[PDB]
Amino acid sequence: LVKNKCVNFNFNGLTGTGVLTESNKKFLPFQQFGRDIADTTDAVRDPQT
Amino acid sequence: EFVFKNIDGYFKIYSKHTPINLVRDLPQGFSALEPLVDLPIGINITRFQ
Ligand SMILES: *[C@@H]1O[C@H](CO)[C@@H](O)[C@H](O)[C@H]1NC(C)=O
Secondary structure (H helix, E strand, C coil): CCCCCCEEEEECCEEEEECCCCCCCCCCCCCCEECCCCCCCCEECCCCC | CEEEEEECCEEEEEECCCCCCCCCCCCCCCCCCEEEEEECCCCCCCCCC
8 A cells, every 4th residue: 555646546446546645534444435526436445455 | 114125136124123112003113224134136026035
């Protein structure tokens, strides 16, 4: 897991490009994804970590 | 409260548990069910007991 650097990211066949930093917002155990108001994939949960 | 729905090949169970101050009926207040279990089964049901 690399953080603070723009890097291509692939999670379970989903690919996006960005800088990945820890998100203060917390979600319930069932959820595996987070989205923005524009229906964009704003946040993720690392599968391994 | 548990809500059961069968769609697109897999059975789904959603449960939220809350204590209620007043015995009569069900609370007017809004509580949202959180998925507890999702089961992938192809079973069909037209009756429940
Ligand atoms: C599923 O249930 C419905 C209603 O009983 C029935 O029409 C259908 O044939 C059942 N099985 C399958 C494989 O579709």
